[PDB]
Design a protein around this motif. Structure first.
Motif, PDB file in Angstrom:
ATOM      1  N   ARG A 110       0.706  -1.303  -0.063  1.00  0.00           N
ATOM      2  CA  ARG A 110      -0.044   0.085   0.053  1.00  0.00           C
ATOM      3  C   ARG A 110       0.962   1.013  -0.226  1.00  0.00           C
ATOM      4  O   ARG A 110       2.310   1.198   0.144  1.00  0.00           O
ATOM      5  CB  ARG A 110      -0.962  -0.015   1.188  1.00  0.00           C
ATOM      6  N   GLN A 138      -4.895  -4.131  -8.257  1.00  0.00           N
ATOM      7  CA  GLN A 138      -5.150  -4.030  -7.016  1.00  0.00           C
ATOM      8  C   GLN A 138      -5.791  -5.587  -6.490  1.00  0.00           C
ATOM      9  O   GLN A 138      -5.441  -5.853  -5.261  1.00  0.00           O
ATOM     10  CB  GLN A 138      -6.490  -3.227  -6.962  1.00  0.00           C
ATOM     11  N   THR A 139      -6.264  -6.272  -7.305  1.00  0.00           N
ATOM     12  CA  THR A 139      -6.608  -8.022  -6.895  1.00  0.00           C
ATOM     13  C   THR A 139      -5.367  -8.394  -6.503  1.00  0.00           C
ATOM     14  O   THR A 139      -5.517  -9.260  -5.612  1.00  0.00           O
ATOM     15  CB  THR A 139      -7.499  -8.285  -8.012  1.00  0.00           C
ATOM     16  N   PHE A 184      -2.734  -7.138  -5.652  1.00  0.00           N
ATOM     17  CA  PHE A 184      -2.120  -6.853  -4.299  1.00  0.00           C
ATOM     18  C   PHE A 184      -3.026  -7.501  -3.101  1.00  0.00           C
ATOM     19  O   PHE A 184      -2.521  -7.877  -1.975  1.00  0.00           O
ATOM     20  CB  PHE A 184      -2.289  -5.427  -4.014  1.00  0.00           C
ATOM     21  N   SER A 185      -4.272  -7.549  -3.195  1.00  0.00           N
ATOM     22  CA  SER A 185      -5.256  -7.897  -2.279  1.00  0.00           C
ATOM     23  C   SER A 185      -5.334  -9.578  -2.215  1.00  0.00           C
ATOM     24  O   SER A 185      -5.808  -9.829  -1.065  1.00  0.00           O
ATOM     25  CB  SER A 185      -6.754  -7.388  -2.506  1.00  0.00           C
ATOM     26  N   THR A 186      -4.837 -10.152  -2.959  1.00  0.00           N
ATOM     27  CA  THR A 186      -4.869 -11.795  -2.940  1.00  0.00           C
ATOM     28  C   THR A 186      -4.032 -12.152  -1.779  1.00  0.00           C
ATOM     29  O   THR A 186      -4.527 -13.216  -0.885  1.00  0.00           O
ATOM     30  CB  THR A 186      -4.204 -12.319  -4.181  1.00  0.00           C
ATOM     31  N   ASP A 187      -2.923 -11.642  -1.448  1.00  0.00           N
ATOM     32  CA  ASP A 187      -2.161 -12.079  -0.197  1.00  0.00           C
ATOM     33  C   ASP A 187      -2.300 -10.703   0.696  1.00  0.00           C
ATOM     34  O   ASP A 187      -1.991  -9.659   0.277  1.00  0.00           O
ATOM     35  CB  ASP A 187      -0.558 -12.191  -0.595  1.00  0.00           C
ATOM     36  N   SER A 188      -2.486 -11.038   1.935  1.00  0.00           N
ATOM     37  CA  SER A 188      -2.533 -10.073   3.003  1.00  0.00           C
ATOM     38  C   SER A 188      -2.533 -10.601   4.340  1.00  0.00           C
ATOM     39  O   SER A 188      -2.984 -10.169   5.304  1.00  0.00           O
ATOM     40  CB  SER A 188      -4.016  -9.373   3.018  1.00  0.00           C
TER      41      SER A 188
END
Lengths: 87, 74, 43, 60
Positions: free
Chosen positions: B33, B67-68, B70-74
């Motif tokens: 981010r 963005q997806t 990036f959001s896949t791993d969190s």
């Protein structure tokens, strides 16, 4: 049971291959199955599902299962069904 | 990489070529981010040299895909 | 009510079957060792 | 009843749908070659269109 069977969802390439083969060799699923890659029962059930789906999509905008309707439903082959979950 | 990509795209726009400039923008949107430095200049080139219906859908699609990712791993 | 048709949270797996089948084995048989207290039984 | 008339109906229904599908994937893969992209490209959907004009409205 054997791991060679592909139980995943039908890819589009094998679906069109199945359509073409089912046109080429009417019936004769035991020989269509090796070329498609699935088992004979899987190919037959998939073809029947495609025909029924086309009929269902046809009804919105408007094959004779009436011959198959005049009797009961198809009795599933015992060996090709998924195993019952254990209690 | 975007640090040199932005200057080279500005030079390309000064020369009089637009296609390779946007091409290297999508090329640089692939290295990664709080990453507003990408999108600020990306959307700035979009506003200054972009048509409404011709190009926006696909590159906003690519933004959503990134963005997806990036959001896949969190 | 012994009618809990509810599918089990732990389904029986093949590797489980082979593992718990092998589990029937124990350590090697331990015999009380013979004591050679004199020369003739040594011979 | 018809192993041939019914076959064409399945072939027709499939054949025109793969044409539009191959159209998208050919379009998207051509852009990744000229950009060395490495990620899957998702269908545009209505969500991008709704956001596109919303983005576009603030631009102009």
């Amino acid at each position: 049971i054997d791991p060679s069977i592909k139980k995943t969802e039908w890819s589009r390439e094998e679906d069109e291959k199945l359509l073409h083969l089912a046109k080429l060799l009417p019936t004769q699923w035991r020989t269509i199955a090796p070329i498609v890659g699935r088992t004979a029962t899987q190919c037959l059930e998939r073809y029947q599902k495609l025909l029924d789906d086309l009929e269902a999509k046809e009804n919105e905008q408007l094959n004779d299962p009436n011959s198959r309707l005049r009797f009961g439903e198809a009795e599933p082959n015992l060996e090709t069904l998924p195993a019952l979950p254990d209690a | 990489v975007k640090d040199m990509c932005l200057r080279f795209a500005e030079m390309e726009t000064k020369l009089g070529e637009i296609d390779r400039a946007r091409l290297i923008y999508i090329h640089g949107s692939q290295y990664c981010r709080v990453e507003t430095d990408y999108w600020k200049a990306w959307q700035e080139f979009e506003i200054r040299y972009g048509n409404p219906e011709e190009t926006v859908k696909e590159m906003l699609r690519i933004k959503r895909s990134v963005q997806t990712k990036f959001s896949t791993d969190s | 009510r012994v009618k809990n048709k509810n599918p089990a949270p732990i389904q029986i797996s093949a590797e489980q079957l082979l593992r718990e089948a092998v589990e029937r084995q124990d350590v090697a048989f331990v015999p009380p060792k013979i004591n050679i207290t004199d020369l003739e039984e040594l011979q | 009843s018809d192993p041939f008339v019914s076959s064409q109906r399945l072939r027709k229904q499939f054949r025109e749908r793969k044409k539009i599908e191959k159209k998208q994937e050919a379009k998207d893969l051509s852009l990744k070659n000229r950009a060395a992209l490495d990620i899957d490209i998702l269908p545009p959907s209505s969500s991008d269109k709704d956001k596109a004009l919303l983005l576009l409205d603030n631009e102009l």
